[PDB]
Design an enzyme around this catalytic site. Structure first.
Site, PDB file in Angstrom:
ATOM      1  N   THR D  45       0.857  -1.215   0.000  1.00 57.52           N
ATOM      2  CA  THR D  45       0.000   0.000   0.000  1.00 57.52           C
ATOM      3  C   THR D  45       0.874   1.239   0.000  1.00 57.52           C
ATOM      4  OG1 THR D  45      -1.672  -1.231   1.208  1.00 57.52           O
ATOM      5  CG2 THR D  45      -1.854   1.259   1.274  1.00 57.52           C
ATOM      6  N   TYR D 133       4.399 -13.081   4.364  1.00 53.50           N
ATOM      7  CA  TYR D 133       3.279 -12.336   3.777  1.00 53.50           C
ATOM      8  C   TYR D 133       2.772 -13.080   2.564  1.00 53.50           C
ATOM      9  CZ  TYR D 133       1.355  -8.267   1.026  1.00 53.50           C
ATOM     10  OH  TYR D 133       0.691  -7.372   0.187  1.00 53.50           O
ATOM     11  N   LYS D 161       1.248 -12.361   7.696  1.00 54.49           N
ATOM     12  CA  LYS D 161       0.134 -11.561   7.133  1.00 54.49           C
ATOM     13  C   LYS D 161      -0.617 -12.323   6.069  1.00 54.49           C
ATOM     14  CE  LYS D 161      -0.688  -7.370   4.368  1.00 54.49           C
ATOM     15  NZ  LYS D 161      -0.024  -6.200   3.850  1.00 54.49           N
ATOM     16  N   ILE D 203      -3.044  -6.230   9.277  1.00 52.51           N
ATOM     17  CA  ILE D 203      -2.250  -5.187   8.612  1.00 52.51           C
ATOM     18  C   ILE D 203      -3.184  -4.598   7.581  1.00 52.51           C
ATOM     19  CG2 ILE D 203      -0.288  -4.701   7.074  1.00 52.51           C
ATOM     20  CD1 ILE D 203       1.229  -6.949   8.922  1.00 52.51           C
TER      21      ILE D 203
END
Ligand SMILES: [K+]
Ligand SMILES: [K+]
Ligand SMILES: [K+]
Ligand SMILES: [K+]
Lengths: 292, 292, 292, 292
Positions: D45, D133, D161, D203
């Site tokens: 992001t 992740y 994540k 997250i």
């Protein structure tokens, strides 16, 4: 006939949901005049799901009667229970239909061994030619090329309606079957591509309302004139796609009524009337094909 | 009863594919003893696809007769034609069943409006409680949470067997429906997570052979004792998965025959006998469950 | 050259993971001798992911040097950041490469407008011809026909490597682009099908180890001798499939070493050595293709 | 800090695409005031894809400097080459960050063994805590629960994540790892369900603009007050969905600009400006959240 443009004909109904004989006659005359190669009677587009076996048999007999030997007729004979697939097929032994279109069991998701045993048994109880019908999106199971290869060794198993839209299947099945095993598209939007790869025709929804073009296109295809065929295809493509804007045959029945080919666009629940937005979409597609 | 561990009971068959009353009796006694909340009679696992409506009604009546008031019975009544669903439901009026498990139309792929009208019509013509049943993998259509919310306003549509394995559905549905609407998992492998998220029980294949553990797991989950429930679930997990190593109900009927709960593991075509490799996967899963 | 059999050449390495010049020379001589039309240098099969931009540029220059004007060389120039795609392309302006193969940004999943702006910009900063490269399975985004149509209006955007394996794309893109826009398969197992539908060649993994057959097959294809082509294809098909038994280029590097074409099958992490089972599978496939 | 509401912070940019220190400062102050547990710096992001390693390191250092000890900072350090991942991690040794968020290799699609060796090597060469992740939708590969269990035995691999939105993963992973391994949602729309199943936080993209509500929702969930958490979540849901109506971080940077939290909503190619229709969807979602 098991090549060229085959119509998966709608079962037109009066407002009560019962077959309309005048509309069916009009539709059959249209296909004769148009150069359609054969009729699939009471397949998916013909609402086999919502007709009982007597009603289904009545529509097949009536279609054959009205065809009057002028155009061959294939009966839809699919069932998820092998016993029931056999019993429905038996209704049409000696009827005058030229073959049966038989879908892979839906719902129960048999293995490949099960699909083999289901079709082998069905074929053993009839002298009629059998066309396999594969459409994983509606059934939740997929008849693979290797299993089709196995089933093509059965004498009266003579072709497949391949409705996945997965073009790789054409040559996968073709390497596994003899040269006279017929390969039919069951997906309008990819059906010229399908023929270009070696397919022999299409069992078509679009042919319901654009039977001359479809017959023309498949003739060109078969002759190897793909560029010429492709011009007709581009004309028909918005119809190929938009006849599924709502669940089939909701759009193609509306389109039939709009063209004055059937008296009403009535369907049986769980099919619902075309929406306003769907009506404007199918009208645009018809205009594009030059049908008004 | 519509909470807890509910068994999707096998239809035990002799070597000819006919219901075996003695095997059914044993299974029913087993569920009464093991604290199963209810019996789903002739659902998917009960081979609804390959029984005709008379056999279907016969099994439901036989089940109810054998249950003899000791355990509630829910009839599978789903059909792809609304008229046929309605008509099948009428057979079970005043039968003594507590409710119906009715699948979304398979094969024909209706729109959300079509599913709405399907289930509304069924509910209208009965006083019996209706449990909606979503399993897109077999049906090719998906009843979305929004359409469930609309349907839940119908007085006698009381719950949903959510069989997608998509756990986000639990709270998407729950926020749209009243507190008393029942959410039931139809996916054994994710059924404990489903309950931990807010679901009220499971309509279970595993329960056919691990009735007591399933009933305990579901009571723990209802009490919020998720860690304790999960211990049981970890021992049932191989069975949760390998009961689907070949098409359901092939593995589970073999399991039932292995435990001595049913006389034969016979199914109707297009279901075929368990392969040798399936026998071993399933036997290993049973042992991991502590059942062998 | 942007037609016929194009190899997506492996970057052979010594045991330290650095390009092996002797092996690369041997590979390039093989392609010259074999009739391969062009080399893609440091594409996906060439491990662009694990080479830094200097290492990547070194391999391109070395390949061009070793090609010695005997076979055209296309550089892989893909990057997920438009700035970095531009900067890498700039390295090869005036290098002697004949074009760039440029993949849709991976990871960041741009819209169709973003994919348009990314490629338009890349093309504006170079005089070199650009081949678009679409492989949604590795990138998480899909360049649609309509966007390819848009980009083909750019002067130096001259073709697409279509690696989806979705054959419907051939004629969808073709109706939208001019006759000299080149359509290349990036999926070995469907590449003859792709050509049969109007494609002009393939950027191939299989060509690494079966360069004569591949060159032969594509010549036949281009001449319209599909039945003849198809015999070579059936020979190569276990390789088309099994070169991906493990992540590419793990199997094709092993196969190169096995054929004595490279000194070692070393790859860079996260690529790991071929497993024993994978080694037996690729050996079987090589035997089937008659390569030993 | 690795529990609760963790923000995947935007990298605010001026009109030239350069980090805007003043906008970053405002965002950091906002998170300190709003009770955000930690900041993921230059994650997805934060546009890790379009910053080079020097800019990436610069943003992390600037973030840490501005945080000034008031909030923990986690660096995005993922890369598709193991060597490059290792080398990027070395830049952040002794920087003051509390840990690293490291994505599964994207593009190259390694096997499970390859992911194992990837993450093992990264963890080996640092003392910093590592959060794995998983986001298959962007990377084309899926770190499976089994490989997570193997990796969790590495001393400094401390969490995951999980950004698939597949909620069955929560307890598949949890049963394989020790009680102190952290499970974090990377999917805003299913993040509350994720926590209700046993996850420890999120997250979050939504947290960029609804910091306080996110922090409260996550504290309620940690306390088991799921019904209370869900009220907040129902108000944040439109934002959970429409922050992805165009590719992330396009909508969220526009949101931040609309709230006055950042000076411009500029992104780097291949991200493009928000469309007008996206503005309205996002503005509607903000209002439903009570933020406008
Ligand atoms: K045959
Ligand atoms: K109700
Ligand atoms: K051009
Ligand atoms: K650890």
């Amino acid at each position: 006939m098991f090549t060229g443009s085959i119509v998966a004909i709608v079962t037109p109904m009066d407002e009560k949901g019962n077959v309309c004989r005048a509309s069916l006659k009009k539709l059959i005359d249209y296909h004769v005049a148009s150069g359609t190669s054969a009729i699939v009677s009471v397949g998916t587009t013909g609402e086999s799901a919502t007709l009982n076996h007597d009603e289904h048999a009545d529509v097949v007999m009536m279609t054959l009667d009205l065809a009057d030997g002028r155009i061959p007729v294939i009966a839809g004979t699919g069932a998820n229970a092998t016993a029931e697939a056999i019993s429905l097929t038996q209704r049409f032994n000696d009827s005058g239909i030229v073959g049966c279109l038989t879908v892979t069991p839906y719902w129960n998701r048999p293995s490949q061994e099960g699909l083999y045993q289901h079709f082998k048994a069905i074929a053993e109880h009839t002298d009629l030619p059998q066309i396999l019908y594969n459409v994983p999106s509606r059934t939740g199971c997929d008849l693979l090329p290797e299993t089709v290869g196995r089933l093509a060794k059965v004498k009266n198993i003579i072709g497949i309606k391949e409705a996945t839209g997965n073009l790789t299947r054409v040559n996968q099945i073709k390497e596994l079957v003899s040269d006279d095993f017929v390969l039919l598209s069951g997906d309008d939007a990819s059906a010229l591509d399908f023929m270009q790869l070696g397919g022999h025709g299409v069992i078509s929804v679009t042919a319901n309302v654009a039977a001359r073009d479809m017959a023309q296109m498949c003739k060109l295809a078969a002759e190897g004139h793909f560029a010429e065929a492709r011009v007709i295809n581009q004309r028909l493509m918005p119809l190929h796609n938009k006849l599924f804007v709502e669940p089939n045959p909701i759009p193609v029945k509306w389109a039939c009524k709009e063209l004055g080919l059937v008296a009403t666009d009535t369907l049986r629940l769980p099919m619902t009337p075309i929406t306003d937005s769907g009506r404007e979409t199918v009208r645009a597609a018809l205009k594009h094909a030059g049908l008004l």
